[PDB]
């Protein structure tokens, strides 16, 4: 079970 | 006893040779079960162990969607970080991630991780408390800022404590006949004469699982490691592992030496002689 993306347009 | 599920992301830019390639592999313990390569003719998440094949269509839809979004996301990461570091437009750069969870013999969470690396070096990681970040440098702290301000840690905790553990337990069950079982090494000793005065004694351990193993040589029952030649533990390709350990000994004193092997699949340690 891979982790869903991650909301926030703020990952990097 | 104790088990782990981990995912491994890798993105690699290739300036003037196309958009950054993204590669993923899933593991349970030392067993790969899932894979993904963005350069595949048709980029799908694909099964690499029997006990996932059984998963329904909806599963693979979800997984593939996550991999495709991952490659998009990581490509942005590569571009953003390239800017922070203000690097030349020349060569390749990589962005890695490793995440997952361990569960104890009791089947409950033990510790979760979610590490990122830029160009082979730590960049940012999720602290073991699952609510803070360790930034390795000036740049990473900018990232840290954005992730805290967006509540990214909480989301990660949610997956790691819940979803990640649930899946792991599910996989442990569905493939118990191989994941929960240890294969003992198949040991032997070979004899390779150098000259009329010295010969090599190589001690093999083959077809074992998992990869955690210990090989050693003794003389008359006493150690002598700074003398021993190893090879790193290598996969055989069939989901088991290999490893050997050699010592150079005086032609005629072979009886002095015994090889000693300890593995999870052995009821008790083993002793070999030539």
């Amino acid at each position: 079970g891979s982790q869903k993306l991650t909301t926030g347009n703020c990952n990097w | 006893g104790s088990h782990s599920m981990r995912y491994f992301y890798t993105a690699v830019s290739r300036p003037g040779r196309g958009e950054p390639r993204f590669i993923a592999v899933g593991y349970v313990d030392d067993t790969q079960f899932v894979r993904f390569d963005s350069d595949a003719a048709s980029p799908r998440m694909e099964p690499r162990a029997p006990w996932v094949e059984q998963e329904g269509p909806e599963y693979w839809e979800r997984e593939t969607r996550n991999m495709k979004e991952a490659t998009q996301n990581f490509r942005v990461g590569l571009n953003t970080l390239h800017g922070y570091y203000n690097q030349s437009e020349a060569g390749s750069h990589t962005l890695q991630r490793m995440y997952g969870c361990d569960v104890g013999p009791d089947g409950r969470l033990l510790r979760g991780y979610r590490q990122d690396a830029y160009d082979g070096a730590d960049y940012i990681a999720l602290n073991e408390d699952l609510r803070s970040w360790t930034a390795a440098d000036a740049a990473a702290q900018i990232t840290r800022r954005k992730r805290e301000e967006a509540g990214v840690a909480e989301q990660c905790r949610n997956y790691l404590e819940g979803t990640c553990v649930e899946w792991l337990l599910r996989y442990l069950e569905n493939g118990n006949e191989t994941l929960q079982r240890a294969d003992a090494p198949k040991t032997h000793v070979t004899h390779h004469p150098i000259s009329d005065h010295e010969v090599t004694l190589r001690c093999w351990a083959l077809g074992f699982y998992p990869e955690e193993i210990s090989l050693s040589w003794q003389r008359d029952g006493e150690d002598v490691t700074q003398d021993t030649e190893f090879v790193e533990t290598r996969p055989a390709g069939d989901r088991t592992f290999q490893k050997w350990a050699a010592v150079v000994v005086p032609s005629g004193e072979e009886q002095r030496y015994t090889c000693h092997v300890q593995h999870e699949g052995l009821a008790e340690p083993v002793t070999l002689r030539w």
């Binding site: - | 290739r14 790969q32 890695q96 082979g120 790193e232 996969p235 055989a236």
Partner: protein, 99 residues
Amino acid sequence: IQKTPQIQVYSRHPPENGKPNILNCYVTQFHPPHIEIQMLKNGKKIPKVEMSDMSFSKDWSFYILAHTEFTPTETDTYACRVKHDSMAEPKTVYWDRDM
């Protein structure tokens, strides 16, 4: 920082002249993840060579497994060739029966 790739070449089962086997080329400990790997029979590219997925270890370095079916004989030599940015010259390792 570039890491030079470590190479091991070895069969899946103990070698027996004239008995079908799997020859493995284990390439580890390198960076970046861009790499070319081919396998040589007597010094001539082998067509069908399977390539496991590019994974990596605790120190972030990459590893990959190349392998192809083969049948050992007394005379036929086998080897592994690796092109990697960290090396100006391609690196070749010959398979040893005893290792």
